[PDB]
Design a binder for these strands. Structure first.
Ligand SMILES: [Ca+2]
Ligand SMILES: [Ca+2]
Length: 314
DNA sequence: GGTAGACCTGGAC
DNA sequence: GTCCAGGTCTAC
């Protein structure tokens, strides 16, 4: 059929594949796990969302990652568009190598990794990542998802429509910095987070040097990148880490939230050393991130995703 | 310098 | 009718 979301079975000639075994990527463990909030399983095993300014539907078989694009006459994805998918999932990074190493230095990781293979990090756009996580504050994944959709719908450019779903690109800095955005966001239910979206959009354009200032962080060290991000309204130590990890290519970045605290205590019997507090505080949270970095290495953040993801499965 | 309380809301015991 | 989710900000 020419309408609605496509499936591999119904529109054979419109899909193209990318060699990728399920052991290197599990869509169902990556896409709805709190990394990106813009993918939906409209059909069983078929996920749709915006990727590289276009709408896609992705699905996998044991050895392949099938992709289709909705842009002109309908056709299969081209080799270059397909490369956009490979980059988004950072497919050049071998997950089997990472799991092996983490499992070698951490017996607990080894036991948990057995059942949760294919958990990796998406290479996300900084703007979308910054504002999506500004909205994650004291929030759950299902709600965050709603807020983000409503936000893109009201301020993001309109893409194509499939069935009754109209896809929108993520809002630009200029749009989010506009007049009365906060009030509009409050009517959309963002709460106090509405204030931060508006404020950070303006801070970036009117005080930090614009988009270029954000994008240049990819070349800066984790230390430098993380410090700059905390300048923004609504961005604390955690939000900044999420952004460094998921959008600025800092794999050693470890976001410390309540989930990670429960994991550290239960599975590692961890307790703060150099810090005062017995529980969560800026000093203890910083120490915990260091604990995981020294345990897992340069890609501690990715290791964190494997457990964090396998933890949400409870 | 390091804790305590306000800020929004909708699924949940 | 109370409680929590990938926190942040600020007063003292
Ligand atoms: Ca800040
Ligand atoms: Ca927290």
């Amino acid at each position: 059929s020419e309408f609605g979301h496509r499936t591999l079975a119904s529109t054979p000639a419109l899909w193209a594949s990318i060699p990728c075994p399920r052991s290197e990527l599990r869509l169902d463990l990556v896409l709805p796990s709190g990394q990106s909030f813009r993918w939906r399983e409209q059909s069983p095993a078929h996920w749709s969302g915006v990727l590289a300014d276009q709408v896609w539907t992705l699905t996998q078989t044991e050895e392949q990652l099938h992709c289709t694009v909705y842009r002109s006459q309908a056709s299969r994805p081209t080799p270059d568009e397909l490369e956009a998918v490979r980059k988004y999932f950072q497919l050049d990074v071998t997950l089997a190598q990472l799991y092996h190493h983490w499992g070698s230095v951490d017996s607990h990781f080894q036991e948990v990794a057995q059942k949760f293979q294919g958990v990796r990090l998406l290479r996300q756009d900084p703007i979308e990542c910054l504002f999506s996580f500004i909205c994650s504050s004291c929030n759950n994944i299902a709600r965050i998802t709603g807020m983000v959709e409503r936000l893109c719908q009201a301020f993001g450019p309109r893409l194509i429509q499939l069935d009754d779903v109209t896809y929108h690109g993520f809002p630009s800095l200029q749009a989010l910095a506009g007049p009365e955005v906060e009030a509009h966001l409050r009517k959309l239910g963002l709460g106090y987070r509405a204030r931060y979206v508006s404020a950070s959009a303006r801070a970036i354009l009117e005080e930090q040097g614009g988009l270029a200032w954000l994008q240049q962080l990819r070349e800066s060290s984790y230390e430098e990148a993380h410090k700059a991000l905390c300048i923004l309204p609504g961005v604390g130590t955690k939000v900044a880490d999420c952004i460094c990890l998921m959008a600025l290519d800092k794999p050693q970045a470890v976001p410390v939230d309540v989930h990670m605290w429960h994991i550290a205590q239960r599975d590692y019997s961890w307790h703060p050393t150099t810090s005062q507090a017995k529980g969560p505080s800026p000093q203890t949270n910083k120490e915990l991130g260091n604990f995981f970095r020294s345990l897992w290495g340069p890609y501690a953040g990715w290791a964190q995703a494997v457990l964090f993801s396998a933890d949400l499965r409870q």
